Amino acid sequence: SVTVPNDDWTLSSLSETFDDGTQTLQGELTLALDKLAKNPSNPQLLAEYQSKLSEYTLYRNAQSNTVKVIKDVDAAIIQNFR
Amino acid sequence: SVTVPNDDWTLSSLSETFDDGTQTLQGELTLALDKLAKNPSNPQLLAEYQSKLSEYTLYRNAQSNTVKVIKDVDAAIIQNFR
Amino acid sequence: SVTVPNDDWTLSSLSETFDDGTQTLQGELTLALDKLAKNPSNPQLLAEYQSKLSEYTLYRNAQSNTVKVIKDVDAAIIQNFR
Amino acid sequence: SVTVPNDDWTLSSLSETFDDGTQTLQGELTLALDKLAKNPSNPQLLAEYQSKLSEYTLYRNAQSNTVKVIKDVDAAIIQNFR
Amino acid sequence: SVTVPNDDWTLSSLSETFDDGTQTLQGELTLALDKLAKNPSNPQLLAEYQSKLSEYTLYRNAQSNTVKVIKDVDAAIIQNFR
Amino acid sequence: SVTVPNDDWTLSSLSETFDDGTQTLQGELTLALDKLAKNPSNPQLLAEYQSKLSEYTLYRNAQSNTVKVIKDVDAAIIQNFR
Amino acid sequence: SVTVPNDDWTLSSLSETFDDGTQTLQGELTLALDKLAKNPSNPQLLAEYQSKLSEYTLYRNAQSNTVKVIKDVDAAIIQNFR
Amino acid sequence: SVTVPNDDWTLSSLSETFDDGTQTLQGELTLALDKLAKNPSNPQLLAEYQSKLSEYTLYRNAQSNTVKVIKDVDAAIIQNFR
Amino acid sequence: SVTVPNDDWTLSSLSETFDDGTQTLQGELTLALDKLAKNPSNPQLLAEYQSKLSEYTLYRNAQSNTVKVIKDVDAAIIQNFR
Amino acid sequence: SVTVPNDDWTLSSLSETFDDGTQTLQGELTLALDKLAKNPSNPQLLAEYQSKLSEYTLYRNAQSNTVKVIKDVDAAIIQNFR
Amino acid sequence: SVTVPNDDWTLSSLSETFDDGTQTLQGELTLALDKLAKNPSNPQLLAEYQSKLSEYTLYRNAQSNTVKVIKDVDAAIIQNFR
Amino acid sequence: SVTVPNDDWTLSSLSETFDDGTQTLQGELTLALDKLAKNPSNPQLLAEYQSKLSEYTLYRNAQSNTVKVIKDVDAAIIQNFR
Amino acid sequence: SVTVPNDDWTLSSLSETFDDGTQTLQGELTLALDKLAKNPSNPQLLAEYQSKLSEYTLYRNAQSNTVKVIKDVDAAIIQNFR
Amino acid sequence: SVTVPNDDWTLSSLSETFDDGTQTLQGELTLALDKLAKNPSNPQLLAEYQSKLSEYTLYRNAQSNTVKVIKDVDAAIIQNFR
Amino acid sequence: SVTVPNDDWTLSSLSETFDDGTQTLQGELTLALDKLAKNPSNPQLLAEYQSKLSEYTLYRNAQSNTVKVIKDVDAAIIQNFR
Amino acid sequence: SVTVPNDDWTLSSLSETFDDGTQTLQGELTLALDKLAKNPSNPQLLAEYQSKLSEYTLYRNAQSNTVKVIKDVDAAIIQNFR
Amino acid sequence: SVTVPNDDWTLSSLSETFDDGTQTLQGELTLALDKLAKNPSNPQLLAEYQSKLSEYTLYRNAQSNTVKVIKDVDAAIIQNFR
Amino acid sequence: SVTVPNDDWTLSSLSETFDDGTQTLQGELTLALDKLAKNPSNPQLLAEYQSKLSEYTLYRNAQSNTVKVIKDVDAAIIQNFR
Amino acid sequence: SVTVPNDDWTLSSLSETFDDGTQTLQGELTLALDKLAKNPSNPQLLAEYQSKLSEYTLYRNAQSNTVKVIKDVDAAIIQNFR
Amino acid sequence: SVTVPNDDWTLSSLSETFDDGTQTLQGELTLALDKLAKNPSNPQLLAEYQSKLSEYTLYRNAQSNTVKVIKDVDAAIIQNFR
Amino acid sequence: SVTVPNDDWTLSSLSETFDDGTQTLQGELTLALDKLAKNPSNPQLLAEYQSKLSEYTLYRNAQSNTVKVIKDVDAAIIQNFR
Amino acid sequence: SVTVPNDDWTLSSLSETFDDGTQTLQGELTLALDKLAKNPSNPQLLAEYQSKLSEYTLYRNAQSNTVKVIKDVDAAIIQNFR
Amino acid sequence: SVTVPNDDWTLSSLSETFDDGTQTLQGELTLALDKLAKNPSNPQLLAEYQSKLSEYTLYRNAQSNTVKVIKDVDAAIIQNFR
């Protein structure tokens, strides 16, 4: 489940890399969201939820931008076939 | 009625999570509001009403912000389709 | 007609508590005032009338101050709604 | 004329709840005010008038603050539409 | 009304897939919009309306991007005829 | 004067939906504003005026945000023509 | 010239209520003051004058306090417009 | 000089509505202020002056808050042009 | 002034189709713009102006994109003459 | 029924903490108020009643201010979600 | 030197109104104070001095309160500029 | 100095339309600002100044947004030349 | 050493007015007190001493009350600064 | 030193307008403050000082709010350059 | 050590103005207090001490209120920086 | 042990000033009281005792009033901190 | 300096047509830019500058696109020489 | 548990830094809150509670603002990927 | 049963301090009152009764004033929580 | 235990400064309160107790206001982080 | 140092135009900032500083937006080279 | 340690300018705070402390707002890089 | 570690330039963040932290935008290879 600029990997492999490399964060975010839905008035809970949510959004954006850039590169090389 | 960063859930599922995870609070707030409308002069009643109202506002704001952030993330990923 | 710092009572309930808890005193004061208006020269009558009148004034002042303080507390809590 | 945090009610419904839940108090206050305007020298009358007036002011303030808070919440959610 | 990367389907078939696969959501959004136009002050109503509207916008954007990408692919293949 | 996510409606139709679905509220607000301009010292009048004004502002904001979002969606689809 | 916590009255209406509800007392006080200015040595005259003057002062104070409290309530509600 | 939530009115129209709907009150306040400046020792004069002054302040505050709220709504709609 | 994918029409015919099919909207927008230039403070006026302006921009963009696409198709066919 | 700045508690928990931590005081105040309503002329009784009433008002104010401050903090953190 | 709720006056104009509308009273008070400082034992002199002094204090208090209230109103309107 | 979605007008024509359609308002605002700079303590003056200033800001914002949107449309059409 | 309700005087000026306006009386009282301390048995001496002493006490009381009242007025105006 | 919504003026011009249009008031306030620092016990002096100070604060607040609003408008227009 | 609403002064300058403008009064009060502490039985001494003490309290209150008001104005202007 | 309205002194310093400035009087009063308790029938003794007792009461009252006034001034200034 | 699809014109002729047909606009833009560089705080100035700048950018883009398209056409015809 | 602008840390690391760097303060606040809930009448207790509560609110606000700013920076950098 | 300005005491503790620190005096007063009710003609008895009664009244007043002042201080600190 | 506007101190440090800088006063007040609870009839004792109590209240108020102001400043700076 | 849409100028020339056309304003802002850093309590100083700072921010924003727009235009023309 | 809108300075330079330009004020405030912590009962001390504290708060707020505004301007220019 | 538009450098070289040219600022920010996490209540600390944080965000944004622009230029040149 690793990725190297060498002979073999793929885009779905990059997405799986982004998912698995940041996995426990998703479970922590799930748990924090549950606790928040229980009682939305505990400050420490709110701070942890904010941190986790921000990190999750950053992860999603980074993954999507990386996939987009790599697809653009590949489509650029393909066109040079002819 | 649970939500996990896994294969399947949705925004309306998040709203329903926020609603059901904090449900008895809404009934308590209803009852306290009724009692308050009966006699607006009992201090204990006022304190309980204040606590419940504050918690309710916090819940609404948290739910709305979470929905907004997730929609922003999704709209960000969609645009990277092309 | 009792009052407890618990779920339900009101200001008018406090006034009624002050009135009913000190009731026979009011009838005694009425009777003494009548007798005094009959013949204002009996010393024992004067002493009893003085005692009853003083106690009545004390009761009125205490009731009014208590009502005022409780209303102030309630108006203080209400403002903290927002 | 009841209100529940469920599918349907409105702000005017909250105001009507505050009005109807505390209705006989308004008639009592009217009657006491009339009697007071007749003869402003009866202590029991004054005590009852004070109690009723205080309770009425508390009711007005509580209703107004509740309406304000709910409107603030609604305007907060609306802005998250976009 | 299904679509598979096999011998037969079309672009309009993709649009119909997007429409029919997300159909009840459109009726729910219609109903919520109607209720909102009735009384724009119920928080639960606002939350449901926000969720449905966000999901609808996401659906429209995804459908349009998918159609665009597939048309681009087809126009790319056509040009390689000669 | 109804609107459904089906073959035919328009933006002006949405605005007319918002206007007609909340119509009697506008007349009530007019009447309350007139009465207020007559004598700005009746508490019940003030409470009703506050409720109606708040609801009116909420309606305006919701209508404007909905129109904005739908126009954004339409302009997004149009650009995918080419 | 009556006042009820219902749709219509005003502050000046409250002042007129206090004035008209206690009217004959003012004429009696005028007459007693005149007689007193004639001969300030009749005990019965002095007692009646004392009673009337005390009642008049009580009426003025009660009216002023009521007007003040109602104005405070109204100014409190007005501020919650925004 | 009337105002209706219909096709045509303006902010200055609202201010003129507040002014003209409460006009005789301003003349009465002028006259009472003049009389007060003549002899500041007549109780009835003082009570009428207090009532009129309080009502005038309430009118000013209500007018200003209404204008502010409507301007806020209009500036909110304008921004949604783009 | 109709257009069909059949033997005869032209690009200017498409532009005229877009213009005439959406004509009354242009007059309504003119009138609304005039009224707005008169008094830029009527909320209903602002909402109608926003709706009309948005629809007009959408119409312009759609017309331009359609003309562009058809010209591209025609220039593609012409080149295949040789 | 304890509260710690750690993973879990809530606003209603703070109110219950204030109530239960100062409980016997409320019963003592009830008893003293009853005795006072019996005979409002015993100095020791008056002193004890004054002490208890003052302490009760202090407790109410402190609880309300604490709840208000914590709600403000929580609403501040929530807004930083986005 | 008159003042009307119309287009033009000012606070200093109100103070000058209070001063000039009650002017001869100030000279009378000066003369009475001088005579009193001459011989503080003439009863008629004492009565006139008491009347004038009381009226003067009333005038000062009324002027100051009026100025304060009007300044408060003006500062309230100014803040609604933005 | 009129503008119609027909053969001929321009952006500067739109700006001149906004200026001339709302012209007397600018003179009124000038006069009110002058009077305010004279004596900043007349409530009616303050209310009129607030109304005029708010309307002026609304006019400026609306004009600027309209110009921006039309320029965006024109720049969109220009790019479709090629 | 005169005092007028005009632009300039002070409290110490009032005290000096009371002292100097009644000055020869103080010397006469001194002389009479000396003579009395010589031989306390001359009736005419006693009558003159009684008259002078009474007038002196009246002067002191009047001066002190006037100073107190003026200080109260000034402290009342000062507080209205804010 | 005048300002008109026409081709040329500036923010500093608005500040200078506020300063020069209310200039003699500043000198009067200086003189009154000096006199007050001399002898803080003359009632007329106190009343004039209160009036001038209140008017000065109103002027400062109005000037600052106007400058703020105009700067906001200008910064809004600037951003629409692109 | 003078102060003018012109380019340069400060709060401490206002305090020093209040101190130096009323300086000899402080020395006189010191001397009178010393004499009073010597023999608290001379009426003239008591009258002078009362006058000086009253004037001193008035000076302190006026200075403090002026400083407070000016600080409030300055803090109001500062916030309008942004 | 002196006190001056300058940089440093305190309330206890004022009390000590009152005590030490009138010290020998206290010893004289002690001695006179002792002698009086010995033989309460010597006229000269009675006159001296009366004089000393009166002066002592005057001293106590003056000290207490001065302390009260200064504390009031200080508490007034403190509140103007905010 | 005119251009017609007839026997004679050129690309530089098209550029000169674009320049001369829109000439006064360039001078107006120069003047407005100068005035803006003088004082960047006049709203009318900002609006005119925005309009002129937008129109100038549109003109540049249109000219460049037209030149590009005509050059492409000419280069297309040239290649068909052989 | 330290954080440095170097190769490795995260948002949750910043939150944990804020929590652990200010830890004993939270326990002290817990203890003080408990003691306060016991007896809300000890001044030293109140002062310590006020200090701790203020510091806690400051800590929460600072942590939240820092997290928000860093997330904004990160989301800014991510977008520059393409 | 001692009280120190240190970590722990309360208002009721102050009342108990006043009661227990002066306890034997109450028993002595009881005994003296009994003896007086037996035979109200013994001079020594009367003197002792007068002394004890005076001391008791002083104790009550001092206790009440101390409690009042401390409650005022505590309520002052509480309000500074926010 | 000193505090300087330099690199390091805190709010609790300010409270400790207020406590330790005024420490012996607290012990003196304790001792005086004890003595007073012993015998509430010694005038010198009463004067010392009054002085100490007044100074203590002043100290508490000053400390609380200073802490409040500094917390307000800090919370103001924190918000400017973003 | 002038700029005209004619044969020769550049971007740095535009920046220098913005700098030199608004130069004295920068020196005035420097001087005002220095004076403010000296004594931040002079209202006139604060008003001038606010005006200058606002104008400076407006100038910076306008310059930056103009440079951005012109660079965009130039980069648009360059791409049409081929 | 000076700052000019010229080639070189920075934000920390602005903060240092605010600190050093107002430096002696900080030492004076330190000294006054120390003296106040010694004896909180000297009026002159209280007045000086109030003045210094107010000026310090003003300085902090002004510095923070200036830094915020300049950072906003810089972040605005940076974004126009692309 | 320098960079010049000459024969050799790279993007990572630009990032390293941005990092090393602003290095001590990062250490200062680290230290300030640590101190802040210690005690979030020192104003000078808060001001320094705000300045450093703002400068850091500006640096990050500038670096990212520069890298983005240079990459865009390079990708533009590469495409012109063919």
DSSP string, R20-56: HHT-HHHHHHHHHHHHHHH-TT-HHHHHHHHHHHHHH
CA distance M16 to O48: 9
CA distance N14 to U52: 12
CA distance D23 to D19: 6
Structure tokens at J73: 């903090």
Angle at O12 between CA O7 and CA O14, to 5 degrees: 70
**Cβ atoms of residues N26 and N20 within 8 Å:** no
Neighbours of chain E (3+ CB pairs under 8 A): B, D, F
Inter-chain residue contact Q64 with U55, CB threshold 8 Å: no
CA distance V56 to W43: 11
CA distance B70 to A70: 25
- Which residues make Cβ contacts (< 8 Å) with residue Q73, sequence separation at least 6? none
**Cβ atoms of residues D54 and B41 within 8 Å:** yes
Query: In angstroms, what is the C-alpha Rg of chain H?
Result: 18
| H81 contact L CB<8A | yes
The domain locations on chain D are 1-82
Count how many Cα atoms sit within 13 Å of the Cα of residue P75 in the half-sphere of its side chain.
17
Structure tokens at E18: 């997007």
Structure tokens at R52: 């701790």
Structure tokens at E69: 């990408």
- Which residues make Cβ contacts (< 8 Å) with residue M38, sequence separation at least 6? none
Residue with structure tokens 């006042």?
G3
Sign, CA dihedral V30-V35-V40-V42, equals: negative
Which among E74, E27, E29, E24 has a CA at the least distance from the CA of E52?
E29
K22, K60, K72, K74: best to mutate for the H interface, most H CBs within 10 A: K22
| B57 contact J CB<8A | yes
| Length of chain B in terms of residues written | 82
Structure tokens at I29: 């927008």
| F53 contact H CB<8A | yes
CA distance S76 to J62: 11
| N45 contact M CB<8A | yes
Name the DSSP letter for residue V8.
Answer: -
Query: In angstroms, what is the C-alpha Rg of chain V?
Result: 18
**Cβ atoms of residues W64 and R76 within 8 Å:** yes
Query: In angstroms, what is the C-alpha Rg of chain R?
Result: 18
**Cβ atoms of residues B10 and C37 within 8 Å:** no
Closest residue to L54, CB basis, from H18, H71, H82: H71
| L44 contact K CB<8A | yes
L1-28 per-residue burial string, b: 16 or more CB within 10 A, e: under 16: eebeeeeeeebbebbbbbbebbeebbeb
Query: In angstroms, what is the C-alpha Rg of chain T?
Result: 18
CA distance D1 to J76: 35
| C79 contact D CB<8A | yes
CA O21 to chain CA mean position, Å: 8
* φ and ψ at residue M32, rounded to 5 degrees: -65, -40
Most distant CA pair in chain D: distance in Å? 62
CA distance P52 to P33: 9
**Cβ atoms of residues B33 and B49 within 8 Å:** yes
CA distance C5 to C10: 10
Structure tokens at K7: 């287009």
- The H or E element spanning position J33 is helix J24-38
Angle at B45 between CA B41 and CA B49, to 5 degrees: 115
* φ and ψ at residue B44, rounded to 5 degrees: -55, -45
**Cβ atoms of residues V29 and T4 within 8 Å:** no
**Cβ atoms of residues O66 and V49 within 8 Å:** no
Which among A34, A59, W53, T78 has a CA at the least distance from the CA of R10?
A59
Q: Calculate how close chain T gets to P63, using CA atoms only, in Å.
A: 8
Count how many Cα atoms sit within 13 Å of the Cα of residue H82 in the half-sphere of its side chain.
18
Structure tokens at M17: 């007015």
Structure tokens at C36: 């005094």
CA distance H49 to H37: 11
| B26 contact J CB<8A | no
**Cβ atoms of residues T15 and T67 within 8 Å:** yes
CA distance W41 to V40: 24
Is residue O67 classed exposed, middle or buried when 0-12, 13-18 and 19+ CB atoms within 10 A define those classes? buried
Structure tokens at B14: 């998040």
Residues of V in contact with O10 (CB under 8 A): 55
Give me the total of CB pairs closer than 8 Å, taking one residue from chain I and one from chain L. Answer: 49
CA distance W56 to W62: 10
Inter-chain residue contact R43 with S81, CB threshold 8 Å: no
Structure tokens at R71: 């997330």
- Taking chain T, what is the end-to-end CA distance rounded to the nearest angstrom? 34
| T60 contact S CB<8A | yes
Structure tokens at N53: 């100070």
Name the DSSP letter for residue F45.
Answer: H
W2: amino acid identity, one letter:
V
Count how many Cα atoms sit within 13 Å of the Cα of residue M53 in the half-sphere of its side chain.
10
**Cβ atoms of residues D11 and E41 within 8 Å:** yes
CA distance I5 to R24: 80
CA distance E25 to E18: 12
**Cβ atoms of residues V29 and T13 within 8 Å:** no
* φ and ψ at residue C54, rounded to 5 degrees: -60, -45
CA B16 to chain CA mean position, Å: 9
Inter-chain residue contact M77 with N41, CB threshold 8 Å: no
Is residue P51 classed exposed, middle or buried when 0-12, 13-18 and 19+ CB atoms within 10 A define those classes? middle
Sign, CA dihedral J38-J43-J46-J48, equals: negative
Residue with structure tokens 């630009």?
W14
DSSP string, C3-49: --SSS---HHHHHHHHHHHT-HHHHHHHHHHHHHHH-TT-HHHHHHH
CA distance R44 to T16: 11
CA distance K82 to N65: 7
**Cβ atoms of residues N68 and N11 within 8 Å:** no
- Which residues make Cβ contacts (< 8 Å) with residue U59, sequence separation at least 6? Q40, U18, U22, U25
C-beta pairs of H21-28 under 8 Å, 24+ apart in sequence: H21/F34, H21/F37, H21/F38, H22/F37, H22/F38, H22/F39, H22/F40, H22/H59, H25/H52, H25/H55, H25/H56, H25/H59, H26/H56, H26/K5, H28/H52
Query: In angstroms, what is the C-alpha Rg of chain Q?
Result: 18
Inter-chain residue contact C82 with D65, CB threshold 8 Å: yes
**Cβ atoms of residues N68 and N16 within 8 Å:** no
**Cβ atoms of residues P27 and V58 within 8 Å:** no
Q: Calculate how close chain U gets to O57, using CA atoms only, in Å.
A: 26
CA distance R48 to N49: 42
- Which residues make Cβ contacts (< 8 Å) with residue B35, sequence separation at least 6? B42, B45, B49, C7, C8
The interaxial angle of helices Q43-79 and L43-79, nearest 10 deg, is 10
Name the DSSP letter for residue T67.
Answer: H
The H helix count followed by the E strand count for chain O is 3, 0
Q: Calculate how close chain F gets to G60, using CA atoms only, in Å.
A: 21
**Cβ atoms of residues E48 and E25 within 8 Å:** no
Most distant CA pair in chain H: distance in Å? 62
CA distance H44 to G15: 10
Q: Which three-class secondary structure state does DSSP give residue P7? A: coil
CA distance N35 to N41: 10
Q: Calculate how close chain F gets to G77, using CA atoms only, in Å.
A: 7
N65: amino acid identity, one letter:
N
Residue with structure tokens 């700029």?
U3
- Residue in V closest to O26 by C-alpha: V44
Structure tokens at B18: 């926020």
| R56 contact T CB<8A | no
CA distance W5 to I81: 50
- 3-class SS string, D47-81: HHHHHHHHHHHHHHHHHHHHHHHHHHHHHHHHHCC
Closest residue to O60, CB basis, from V43, V57, V68: V43
User: Helical H runs in F22-42?
Assistant: 24-38
| B76 contact A CB<8A | yes
| O74 contact V CB<8A | yes
CA distance T60 to P78: 10
**Cβ atoms of residues B31 and C65 within 8 Å:** no
CA distance U23 to M73: 55
DSSP string, chain A: ----SSS---HHHHHHHHHHHT-HHHHHHHHHHHHHHH-TT-HHHHHHHHHHHHHHHHHHHHHHHHHHHHHHHHHHHHHTT-
Name the DSSP letter for residue J40.
Answer: T
How many other CB atoms sit within 10 Å of the CB of residue K74? 24
How many other CB atoms sit within 10 Å of the CB of residue O28? 17
Residue with structure tokens 């005694």?
C28
Q: Which three-class secondary structure state does DSSP give residue M39? A: coil
Inter-chain residue contact P67 with T50, CB threshold 8 Å: yes
CA L42 to chain CA mean position, Å: 28
CA distance I63 to I70: 11
- The H or E element spanning position U27 is helix U24-38
Q: Which three-class secondary structure state does DSSP give residue B74? A: helix
| D78 contact B CB<8A | no
The H helix count followed by the E strand count for chain N is 3, 0
CA distance E42 to D11: 8
* φ and ψ at residue Q5, rounded to 5 degrees: -65, 75
